[PDB]
Every structure is written in C-alpha cells, then in structure tokens.
C-alpha cells in the first residue's frame, strides 16, 4: 500500500462503511503498475454525488451533473466519481460498466481497499507490453469522441508507449472527425504532448496519422513535423519556450496569428513571439548586447538560449551562467532605475512636453546601460547637454 | 491577525509578489467584524484565473468562466476570484468595482494583508446596527437577481439582522420575480434559512414580504408561517427533521408531493415522511412500542422525539435517553438478526415458496421483539408449529 493511496484509503473506507463500494481507478493505478511516480489518485464509487457530499465534510461540487465531486480529505483534493455509462449520463452500480467507458486499456484498471488489482480489459498486459490500445472498437470509440485520437498521440509523448496496429490504423481512417472538437480542448492536448519526454516522437506520429491538418496551423506541414524529431524538446522548461520551438520547427513566419488560432492566453502568445523574435535577431549566444539583454530582461534572455539549445544540440549551462553574470553588471536592470525622469529632460532642454521626450530618455538609458555615462543625475545632464550641441555640428 | 486569515495570508502575499494585489473579501470579513466564528475565508484579486493557476501548485478550476478558482494552500480550500462587474462577465483591476457588485453592505467589506478594513459602502455601520441593506438600489438589485430577496430573509435567519425599511419594502414590491429562478437555487436558500438560529422569525418575514406564494407548496399558507414562530426550530439537528417540522407547521397533508416540489434528494423526502408518519402514528412519547421502535430504527426514533420537542416545547433529553435504553433491550435490532430464515419456515410447514412466507416471518420477529418467544431456532419452531394448529381451532 504505497503512501499515495494509503492516505486516500480513508475515502474508500468511509464510503464502504455506509454501504457503497468504491475503488481507486485511473492513471494512479496505471502509474503504479507502470512504476511512474503517482500523481492524482482518483476514486470512483457507486455512491451518488449527493451521498458523497453528505458523508465528507469538505466537498467541492465540480460537476455533479456527470458524477464528479472533488473531496478534500486530510488536506488533499480527490476526484470522486459516481459510476457511469457515457450516453446526459447514466449512473450504475457496476464498477465494470464504468471502466468499460474508459479511453484506453492502460487506463481502465482499478484497485480495491485491500490492494487487489481489477483488470478486466487487459490494461495489465498493455502496460507490460507498453502499448496504447482502445477499450473496445478503436473505430467506434473515436466516433463518440474524436479527441480520443489526440490523447493517444499524447500518451505516446508522456509514456513512450506505442500505438496499437488497429488503434493507429483507425486514427488515420477517422482523422477528419477532429474538426468537430472545440479548439480549447485541442490546445490542452497539444500542450501536454509538448512536455512529453517522448514528444520527440509524438509530433512525427501526429503526421503519420491523419491527425495532422485538422489541428490549427498544422496544415500540410507533414515534412516539418517529422523533422521535428531532432529537437531537444524535453529541455524546454516552460509553455512559451515550448510553443516557441513548435513554430521554429514548423518554419513559421508570423508567430501572432498562428499561436492565437490555438486560443492560447495572450501573455503566452506575446512571450512566445518575444523569444522567437529575439531568437531571429540574435543568431549567436556570444552576441547578446547589454542593450538587447536589458530589453529582453533576464528571464526571457535565458528562455531564448534554451529554445536555442533545444534546436542546436548545445547545452545552455555556460550561456545561462554567462547571461546571469552580465545581467547583474548592467548598471540598470529596468527603466524605473534611471537616475533621471522625463520631467527632468524637459526643464532641462527648455522644450514643451512632447514625443521628442521619449527618444531622449530612450537614448539616455541606452547610454547608461552601455556604460557611456554614469546613472547619476548631474552626469546625465552634462551628457545630454553636450550631446545636443553636437546635433547642431552634425547638420 | 486571527488564525483563519493568518494561514491564508500566504495566498495574498504570493499574488502581491507577482505584482497583482489581492484581498480577503466576503463573509469571513463580516464574520470577523461581527464576531462570529469565521467560516470560509475568501480571496479576491486582480490576477486572472490563469495567473492564479500558474502561481499555486494545486489549483482546482471550478468556474474560471466567471473568475473563480479554488486554490488548495497549506491543506485548505480557498475560493480565489478575479475582480468582476456582473454584466458573460467583465474582469477589472478595481477592488471597488468588485465589492460594488456584492449583494448586501455587510458582505461587501474587504481586508488587506496588513489587516486594514476597506468598507467603502457602510457595511461596517450596517454590522454595528445589525442590518441587512442592499448595495445600491434595493429595487434594481432584486431585478437582476430575484434570489437576492431570498437570501435577505435567510440572513435574518443566520444572523438576526433586521431588514432595512427600503430593502424590506422593495421585496414585497418585486416579490413576483422569484418564479423565474430555478427551484434548485430556491431549495438551498430555504435549507439554510431553516437552520437559522433566528429561523423562528425568518419564516414569518417570508410571509410579511411578498416572498411567500412564489416558493414551492407555500401558496397562501400565510397564517401557518407566522404561527410557525413558536416552534423550537434550533433544536432540529438534521435536514430531514427540519423539513419534517416545516410540514407539520404548515399543516401539510401528503409529505411526498410537497417536499418533492422542492427537488430535495429522495432519501430525504422519504426519511422526512418517515418521521412525519411515525409522529402522527405515535402521539405520545410513552407509547413507543418495541414493534414501532424496531420498525423505525433508533436514529429515526430519536429524530421523531426531537421534531416533537421542536413543537411541544418539551426537551427530548429524557426520551432520547429512554429510547436509546430500550433499543439495546430489543432482543433483535434488525431483521437480519432473526435466528430463522424464510427457507426455514418452508421446510417446516411443508408448503411451496410463496407470499404466505412473508406473513410468517413478519410475525416471527414481531414475536421475538415483543419477547413472546426466544430468538433461537428450536424455540421459534415449536412456536410456529403450535400457533398453526391454533389457526385451525379459530376457524
Ligand atoms: Mg491529488
Ligand atoms: Mg476554507
């Protein structure tokens, strides 16, 4: 009885005492059998959502409409679910009828309070063999929910399982059905597929199956995806960096339109381009300039080099260290630190408040950062003065 | 800085460090200022749902669509909410614009990381004066959501605040608007209103305001409600017992149709009847009979006597003690304990399996429970035998 379940045992135990019968189902089970670290433990029971909210003090209705209720037990969230058969939804009392609705064998295992594995569908073999197989007719399933084909590729990314001959086949055959699923639900899948320690072979597959050309911006990029294999995906730390590379490997032009089609939140789509851009502008890690670095701000700067590593093959280490070094040598790290404010430049150059002011400060920092003049009021003054009569000798 | 908030401080603290600005808003605040034990601490912020799910490890999307996200911090659930103006919903950055959307003054208070109360709407005075006042035009508010009038009466139940002259007035005027709100949402409100330490005066009000005659089964019972005042509501322990009494005080006939209209879950509407029934059947606490008790099974039995107390004025104490005493003297406490099963009566009276069997066993327990015959196989046998030739001397 590994600690993940140990704690959550209570929930089962309690639901059983009130005469209900419940099981650990789900990834948690697979993850145990497979020997991955165990993430969320999930419980399913014959107890109806209400009965669940009656027995446990802290409850959190998430969707009692489809039989799910989150139960805060001993300071951890647990997803409790009333057995169901995907039609509205129908509640039953048969564990077996519930698992039979699950997506792929390796998911439809279950384990009881005593630790006794209940694999009625071969999950257990699927996991030994490291294979993704559909629970029932690979075809029929995909018809009910096309997104199921998405996840299949995803799982390949997160687990390094291989598709099943029949499963894989079916996908290609029913690929089109995808254009019916909301973009949203497509994003999240693609999102996980990209952090896969196997993404390196997930993306290719995405093309070798029909699935390509029904996903936003991935029209006919077949070639590009397969080539993607080489990219060192796994070192991508964060979301932006991920999408960043997704582009650069699809030889994408304008970042903005594309990433937006995937209905990603703005901040991402912006910071995505940010890097992509900075990446195109600086082609070599030696060439980062006090300016560009200052502009891009440490975080991004590093994220660039990493995206870059993800492509070159070169490890960031040395760069990341160097960047972090310089960044603390920049005699200013944000504009707010500038010794000298816009109203200082006005009272100084006897000129009315305008657009010329931007340009001014915009050249005072670029001059502080580049170590031309100190970041002290007095000195920036002379500096600006003696530079303005120079623009009278130049024209 | 009282412990309930002390712990949740972390959340604010972290959201501020990422440049967002958040506050304890809600009942928590009211409860502090009022001096009640503090229930759920609620946080609202300018950080958008996503930013919230980015910063905290364990998140639980409940409804990011309306700006709410549950954040499990240090082993407790906290309802975090992006500031909003009730239109779909519009997110802002002004705390003030958020509180301005809250139902009643006493709710629209807020407190900052340093413990500095922000009452921009008189909540703080409302709490001193112990009054329920609408945030803005009592009329306009009720038009947006009629249920707001419900809560108003509820709060009276939970708090013992009085309605505001203008608030109260408005309710009667816009009473009708209620029939537009889903029954579901009406039940929950009624539910809380019944557990009120001031329910005793909440139900009356419910009638003195239009609000009566738009709520299920509460058509023209005006009289009944006001009289309700006398009932010792507050000793009601559980849900059934509550509804039980709600009936008995409205002089309700058939429990089943009524309670159902309030879309209460079956188990309740059954156990409600259960008591209401056993209550009509046994009019005095001395009269419980081994049979009846055995039938109703300790729990309900007590629940009867309490519901009764809630009405008579007599304290349960002595009865609840006496019931609990007998119930362990009943020589059986369920039918499952019966020494003798139905297949025993068949191989015994050489007759084919039928309906006469029920009637048999159904008189063997009734005879065990009443202490006529032991609950041993042998002895029940003779007893059954020697009683069956008696049904030959009788006709
Ligand atoms: Mg968990
Ligand atoms: Mg809480």
Curated annotation (Swiss-Prot), chains A, B:
Reaction it catalyzes = a tRNA precursor + 2 CTP + ATP = a tRNA with a 3' CCA end + 3 diphosphate; a tRNA with a 3' CCA end + 2 CTP + ATP = a tRNA with a 3' CCACCA end + 3 diphosphate
In this chain, Mg(2+) is annotated as bound at 40, 42
Q: Which keywords does UniProt give here? A: ATP-binding, Magnesium, Metal-binding, Nucleotide-binding, Nucleotidyltransferase, RNA repair, RNA-binding, Transferase, tRNA processing
Task: Give the binding site residues for CTP.
Answer: 27, 30, 102, 145, 148, 151, 154
Q: Which InterPro entries does the UniProt record give?
A: Bact_CCA-adding_enz_type3_sf, CCA-adding_enz_C, CCA-adding_enz_firmicutes, NT_sf, PolA_pol_head_dom, PolyA_RNA-bd
**Could you give a single Gene Ontology term from the biological process aspect?**
tRNA 3'-terminal CCA addition
Question: Transmembrane ranges?
Answer: none
Keyword DNA repair carried by entry = no
| Secreted is among the record's keywords | no
Enzymatic class: transferase
Q: What EC number(s) would the UniProt record show?
A: 2.7.7.72
**Residues marked May assist in discriminating ATP from CTP (site):** 103
* More details: A single active site specifically recognizes both ATP and CTP and is responsible for their addition.
The entry's free-text remark on domains says: The crystal structure reveals a seahorse-shaped subunit consisting of four domains: head, neck, body, and tail. The head domain contains the nucleotidyltransferase activity. The neck domain provides a specific template for the incoming ATP or CTP, whereas the body and tail domains may be involved in tRNA binding.
Q: What is this protein called?
A: CCA-adding enzyme
Origin organism is Geobacillus stearothermophilus
Gene transcribed to yield this protein: cca
């Amino acid at each position: 009885m590994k600690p993940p379940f140990q704690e959550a045992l209570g929930i089962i135990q309690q639901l059983k005492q009130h005469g209900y019968d419940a099981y650990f189902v789900g990834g948690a089970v697979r993850d145990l059998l497979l020997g991955r670290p165990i993430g969320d433990v999930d419980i399913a029971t014959s107890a109806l959502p209400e009965d669940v909210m009656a027995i446990f003090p802290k409850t959190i209705d998430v969707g009692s409409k489809h039989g799910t209720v989150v139960v805060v037990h001993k300071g951890k969230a647990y997803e409790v679910t009333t057995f169901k058969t995907d039609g509205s939804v129908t509640f039953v009392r048969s564990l077996e009828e519930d698992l039979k609705r699950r997506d792929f064998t390796m998911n439809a295992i279950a384990m009881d309070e005593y630790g006794t594995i209940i694999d009625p569908f071969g999950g257990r073999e699927a996991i030994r063999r490291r294979i993704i197989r559909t629970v029932g007719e690979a075809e029929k399933r995909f018809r009910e929910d096309a997104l199921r084909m998405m996840r299949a590729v995803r799982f390949v990314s997160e687990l390094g399982f291989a598709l099943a001959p029949d499963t894989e086949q079916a996908i290609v055959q029913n690929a089109p059905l995808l254009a019916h699923i909301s973009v949203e639900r497509m994003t999240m899948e693609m999102e996980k597929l990209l952090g896969g320690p196997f993404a390196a072979r997930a993306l290719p597959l995405l093309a070798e199956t029909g699935l390509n050309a029904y996903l936003p911006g991935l029209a006919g990029k077949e070639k590009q995806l397969r080539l993607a294999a080489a990219y060192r995906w796994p070192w991508l730390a964060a979301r932006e960096e991920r999408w960043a590379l997704l582009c650069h490997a699809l030889g994408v032009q304008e970042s903005r339109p594309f990433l937006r089609a995937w209905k990603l939140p703005n901040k991402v789509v912006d910071e995505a381009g940010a890097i992509l851009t900075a990446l195109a502008d600086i082609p070599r890690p030696e060439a980062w300039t006090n300016e560009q670095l200052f502009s891009a701000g440490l975080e991004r700067a590093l994220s660039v080099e990493t995206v870059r590593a993800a492509f070159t093959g070169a490890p960031p280490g040395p760069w990341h260290e160097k960047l972090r070094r310089r960044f603390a040598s920049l005699p200013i790290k944000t504009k707010g630190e500038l010794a000298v404010n816009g109203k200082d430049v006005i009272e100084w150059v006897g000129k009315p408040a305008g657009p010329w002011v931007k340009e001014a400060l915009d050249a005072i920092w670029r001059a502080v950062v580049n170590g031309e003049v100190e970041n002290e009021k007095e000195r920036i003054y002379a500096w600006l003065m003696e530079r303005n009569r120079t623009r009278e000798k130049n024209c």
